[PDB]
Amino acid sequence: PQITLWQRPLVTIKIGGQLKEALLDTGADDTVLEEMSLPGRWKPKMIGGIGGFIKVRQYDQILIEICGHKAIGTVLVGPTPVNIIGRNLLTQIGCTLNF
Amino acid sequence: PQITLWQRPLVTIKIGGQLKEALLDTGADDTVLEEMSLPGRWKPKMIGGIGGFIKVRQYDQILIEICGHKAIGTVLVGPTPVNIIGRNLLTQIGCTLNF
Ligand SMILES: CC(C)[C@H](NC(=O)N(C)Cc1ccccn1)C(=O)N[C@@H](Cc1ccccc1)[C@@H](O)[C@H](O)[C@H](Cc1ccccc1)NC(=O)[C@@H](NC(=O)N(C)Cc1ccccn1)C(C)C
């Protein structure tokens, strides 16, 4: 699609057989989802933003589908206000910024 | 221009005839710049992110220019580690997400 930015670029993702909404976020390096159980082993990790650092769990090599496009990569799960799709997965689906 | 997401989408902005660099960020609602003293009237504000909130000063009607494109709007100033161009100014420059 072409997405304009008059509103938040929220899309539907499919992950772990769940449907969620998530924000397509060019300013995030990483992908951060709200707390959930995923299959897999995980490593504790820290990530930061405005306001500080949070503790998250890192899951590697996770399959996610964003608007019908598949991505396989690292997902962090932790106490985020909103599900964030970062540049690690946006690049896999061929996302660009245009103007 | 088409900006790819392999690297962080940092561009040059001009604000007050200063060049700076800034992150084009579709996940930010607002624009947030590193501490600087602008003329103008301000309001105190709090903005949140990953690890919590910071305190900023809000200036309205600021002209910024982003890759030769002018935009005019609200800018928040405070102790951010990076300059962030948010959706309030990205929309004005006609910026889209495409995949
Ligand atoms: C999500 C994490 C992994 C991300 N961090 C990083 O990517 N890094 C720390 C790497 C880095 C280092 C240096 C330079 C650039 N990047 C982040 O917080 N990114 C911020 C920008 C930023 C980068 C570095 C340091 C500080 C800040 C931003 O790109 C991202 O869009 C976040 C996402 C988010 C939204 C809501 C709540 C929590 C996170 N937005 C924000 O932090 C903005 N807030 C909002 O827009 N809102 C709270 C409104 C809102 C609410 C709900 C949904 C959307 N918007 C700030 C900049 C104003």
Q: Could you tell me the CATH number of the domain that includes residue B70? A: 2.40.70.10
Contact, B80 vs B54, CB < 8 A? yes
Hey, what are A4's tokens? Answer: 């304009």
Instruction: Give CA–CA dist A47/B93, Å, rounded.
Output: 31
Determine the distance from the C-alpha atom of residue B65 to the mean position of all C-alpha atoms in its chain, rounded to a whole number: 10
Q: What are phi and psi of A33, to 5 degrees?
A: -110, 150
Instruction: Give CA–CA dist B62/B51, Å, rounded.
Output: 28
Bridge pairing between strands B96-98 and B43-49: unpaired
Hey, what are A7's tokens? Answer: 């509103």
Q: Which of B26, B49, B69 is the closest to A49 by Cβ?
A: B49
Residue among A2, A3, A58 nearest A33 (CA): A58
Quote the minimal CA–CA distance from A98 to chain B in Å.
Answer: 5
Q: Which residues of B32-70 are buried (b: 16+ CB within 10 A; e: fewer)?
A: bbeeeeeeeeeeebebebbbeebebbbbeebebbbeeee
Which residue reads 């992908």 in tokens? A31
Hey, what are A39's tokens? Answer: 């299959």
Residue among B9, B74, B71, B46 nearest A24 (CA): B9
The string of DSSP letters for A16-40 reads TTEEEEEEE-TT-SS-EE-S---SS
Residues framing ligand 1 (Cβ under 6 A): A 8, 23, 25, 27-30, 32, 47-50, 81-82, 84; B 8, 23, 25, 27-30, 32, 47-50, 81-82, 84
Contacts of B23 in chain A (CB under 8 A): 26-27
Q: What are phi and psi of A10, to 5 degrees?
A: -85, 130
- Domain tally, chain A: 1
Q: Does B52 touch chain A (CB under 8 A)?
A: yes
Domain containing residue B51: 1-99
Specify the DSSP class assigned to residue B88: H
Strand locations in A25-80 (E): 32-33, 43-49, 52-66, 69-77
Residue A25 appears among annotated catalytic residues: yes
